[PDB]
Design a protein around this ligand. Structure first.
Ligand code: LMT
Ligand code: LMT
Ligand code: LMT
Ligand code: D12
Ligand code: D10
Ligand code: OCT
Ligand code: OCT
Ligand code: HEX
Lengths: 49, 240, 179
């Protein structure tokens, strides 16, 4: 595999470049936040007398 | 159901063209068996991913036939040429054949996914439509490579007729003998022409640019829509 | 709606780029891929002609059928330059000789596929009755695309190849050498 790519440096670059633009495209679409959801969910029942 | 009919019809027509060239029931059968195998498997993949059978997945199938049949043809034809270029027997020939294209079949499926996948990423309502095609066509191509690597070689090696070194069907009498002779001839005429063009050129890059600008011309002029209105055999009338 | 439109350019842009990268890996070359990618227009033109002719529109069905036509002509060109290149590399065949032997070994398979598929979509362009709007739209784009793709590619691809092999070489031929 290393021996494979030692002789095929272009093939090596191609893989690296495809990974990079997949990631670049990911960054344009990823949500941003301080935290993911970490608090447990809650349900409230409200009533009045 | 009409799309289904076209699928069946398409496979029949494929069988006829294969025959015109392969001229042997058992040989034409190979590329012919490959199509339904891949198509049926594609439905299984659609189920696996939770897609439905709809107008778009069905046209995906139809369009897929071009890609599928080419996989089988490339495999079956290359073996032939080999048995003609060498007189090597069928089992030995597909081996050497597969040895020399198999790498390419796999690579091609890869570059092709690069042309159909991107459309799975269209946004909004538009996107769900294009995605039906993308997944159907990619899955079919992937299965087609699988089939070309498993079934087709096995089939070539057992169902193909030994071709003798040098034979090209000219020995045949009737239509094929005639057809085969015309093609062999028309082929030398093809190469003769390219050989010429390659001594020229410059002019053909100029013709190429004509075609590009023309293409561009037609493109910006062709109006764009989404999906056609169909006559669905019903309609409504509003009264206010 | 706003929302916003036209993602087409961006997405086929990346499509082109990925196709280029894939081909470069396949050929272990940054230049040779152009000899395949230049075929793209050759199928489009026929698709546009046939659609312009039947009064069709640039719609979903036109687009997908085009990608298919492009896919196939790409595949044809890939197998042609794969053969030429190998000939020049494994055997010692010189440029022109290899291009011609490649192109001639590839003519038949190309024709078998083109004819099988153009006929195969005939029922579609000819369709009348339920869903024939969709059927017509699919079929005619493909038929025109495949026709031009086929006739234009078998002459042009050999051109693309030698023209690209020259421009992007490095004084070492174009005889003929070996081994
Ligand atoms: C060349 C090979 C590749 C091309 C083949 C593609 C075929 C495409 C089929 C699409 C339309 C089929 O639609 C589907 O058909 C079957 C046929 O009975 C139905 O299935 C129904 O019939 C059979 C009995 O006869 C029962 O097993 C089943 O319980 C019942 O639901 C489905 O409910 C229907 O939704
Ligand atoms: C991690 C995310 C992204 C994944 C990376 C993307 C992969 C893109 C690859 C597409 C093309 C691959 O295609 C592959 O190329 C190599 C190198 O020429 C070929 O390898 C074959 O051909 C070459 C050249 O003729 C030979 O030197 C080699 O010994 C032989 O095995 C494979 O037969 C082919 O299948
Ligand atoms: C190298 C391999 C791949 C090469 C790529 C080849 C593909 C060529 C044809 C692609 C389609 C181009 O056509 C383009 O499509 C988009 C939508 O999809 C249209 O977009 C237009 O109509 C749609 C309607 O739904 C709107 O959403 C959009 O905002 C509007 O601008 C364009 O009017 C049209 O110009
Ligand atoms: C010595 C080899 C140089 C190879 C250059 C490849 C550069 C590709 C960079 C792509 C960045 C996205
Ligand atoms: C000699 C064994 C070659 C191994 C090649 C590995 C290819 C990995 C492609 C990602
Ligand atoms: C996508 C552009 C690639 C440029 C390659 C040039 C190689 C010399
Ligand atoms: C996407 C960038 C590819 C550039 C390759 C350049 C090779 C010299
Ligand atoms: C859009 C053409 C409608 C005819 C289909 C029956």
């Amino acid at each position: 595999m290393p021996n494979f790519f030692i002789d095929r440096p272009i093939f090596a670059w191609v893989i690296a470049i495809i990974i990079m633009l997949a990631g670049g495209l990911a960054i344009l679409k990823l949500p941003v936040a301080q935290y993911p959801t970490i608090a447990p969910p809650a349900v409230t029942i409200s009533a009045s007398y | 159901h009409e799309v289904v009919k076209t699928l069946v019809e398409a496979i029949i027509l494929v069988f006829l063209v294969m025959y015109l060239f392969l001229q042997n029931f058992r040989a034409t059968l190979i590329p012919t068996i490959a199509v339904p195998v891949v198509l049926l498997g594609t439905f299984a993949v659609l189920a696996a991913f939770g897609f439905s059978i709809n107008t778009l997945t069905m046209f995906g199938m139809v369009l897929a036939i071009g890609l599928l049949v080419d996989d089988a043809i490339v495999v079956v034809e290359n073996v032939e040429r080999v048995m003609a270029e060498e007189g090597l027997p069928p089992k030995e020939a597909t081996r050497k054949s597969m040895g020399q294209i198999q790498g390419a079949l796999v690579g091609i499926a890869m570059v092709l996914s690069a042309v159909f996948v991107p459309m799975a990423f269209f946004g909004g309502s538009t996107g769900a439509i294009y995605r039906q095609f993308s997944i159907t066509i990619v899955s079919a191509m992937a299965l087609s490579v699988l089939v070309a690597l498993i079934l087709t070689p096995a089939l070539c090696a057992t169902m193909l007729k030994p071709i003798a070194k040098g034979d090209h069907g000219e020995g045949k009498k009737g239509f094929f003998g005639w057809f085969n002779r015309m093609f062999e001839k028309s082929t030398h005429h093809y190469t003769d022409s390219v050989g010429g063009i390659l001594r020229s050129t410059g002019r053909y890059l100029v013709l190429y640019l004509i075609i590009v600008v023309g293409m561009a011309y037609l493109f910006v002029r062709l109006p764009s829509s989404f999906l056609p209105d169909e006559d669905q055999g019903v309609f409504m009338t509003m009264v206010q | 709606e706003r929302l916003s439109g036209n993602q087409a350019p961006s997405l086929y842009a990346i499509s082109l780029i990925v196709v280029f990268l894939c081909l470069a890996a396949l050929y272990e070359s940054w230049s040779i891929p152009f000899s395949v990618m230049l075929v793209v227009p050759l199928g489009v033109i026929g698709a546009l002609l046939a659609a312009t002719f039947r009064g069709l529109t640039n719609d979903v069905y036109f687009q997908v059928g085009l990608l298919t036509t492009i896919g196939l002509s790409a595949k044809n060109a890939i197998l042609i330059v794969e053969f030429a290149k190998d000939l020049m590399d494994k055997e010692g065949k010189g440029l022109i000789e290899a291009t011609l032997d490649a192109v001639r070994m590839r003519l038949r398979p190309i024709l078998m596929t083109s004819l099988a598929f153009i006929l195969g979509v005939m029922p579609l362009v000819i369709s009348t009755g339920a869903g024939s709007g969709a059927q017509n739209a699919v079929g005619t784009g493909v038929m025109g695309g495949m026709v031009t793709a086929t006739v234009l590619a078998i002459f042009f691809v050999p051109v693309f190849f030698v023209v690209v092999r020259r421009r992007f070489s490095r004084k070492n031929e174009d005889i003929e050498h070996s081994h």
